[PDB]
Design an enzyme around this catalytic site. Structure first.
Site: not given
Ligand SMILES: [Cl-]
Ligand SMILES: [Cl-]
Ligand SMILES: [Cl-]
Length: 129
Positions: A35, A46, A48, A50, A52, A59
């Site tokens: 990650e 991301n 969308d 959002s 992380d 998220n």
């Protein structure tokens, strides 16, 4: 902060993540490796909209507030910035909620794709724990 492998394993254990919800410490270290490469300051945007955050790339759609993810929730009740701290407490406490949400560590797609079913014990091999 960029953690060493064993250093992170030790910190995760200190915070009660070892075998949490049945997931051995190597699972958590492996997830963090892929990650964030063990970097607490890791962020990624991301598709969308959002973002992380942190060592476990938690998220903003569900788990933290960043003020810039429309229609999102903040189920860990924290600013997303808290997930970037050198102190992993906020990331660990939030991860405990995430992994308890129903799908276990599959919530981390990188865990599913790169850690699940592998020899995750290798991630804590040699570590004084
Ligand atoms: Cl393990
Ligand atoms: Cl928001
Ligand atoms: Cl992946």
């Amino acid at each position: 902060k960029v953690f060493g492998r064993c250093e992170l394993a030790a910190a995760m254990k200190r915070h009660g993540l070892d075998n949490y919800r049945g997931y051995s410490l190597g699972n958590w270290v492996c997830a963090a490796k892929f990650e964030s490469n063990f970097n607490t300051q890791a962020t990624n945007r991301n598709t969308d909209g959002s973002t992380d955050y942190g060592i476990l790339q938690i998220n903003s759609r569900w788990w933290c507030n960043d003020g810039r993810t429309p229609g999102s929730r903040n189920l860990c009740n924290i600013p997303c910035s808290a997930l970037l701290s050198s102190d992993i407490t906020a990331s660990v406490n939030c991860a405990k909620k995430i992994v308890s949400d129903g799908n276990g560590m599959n919530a981390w797609v990188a865990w599913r794709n790169r850690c699940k079913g592998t020899d995750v014990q290798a991630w804590i091999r040699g570590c004084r724990l």
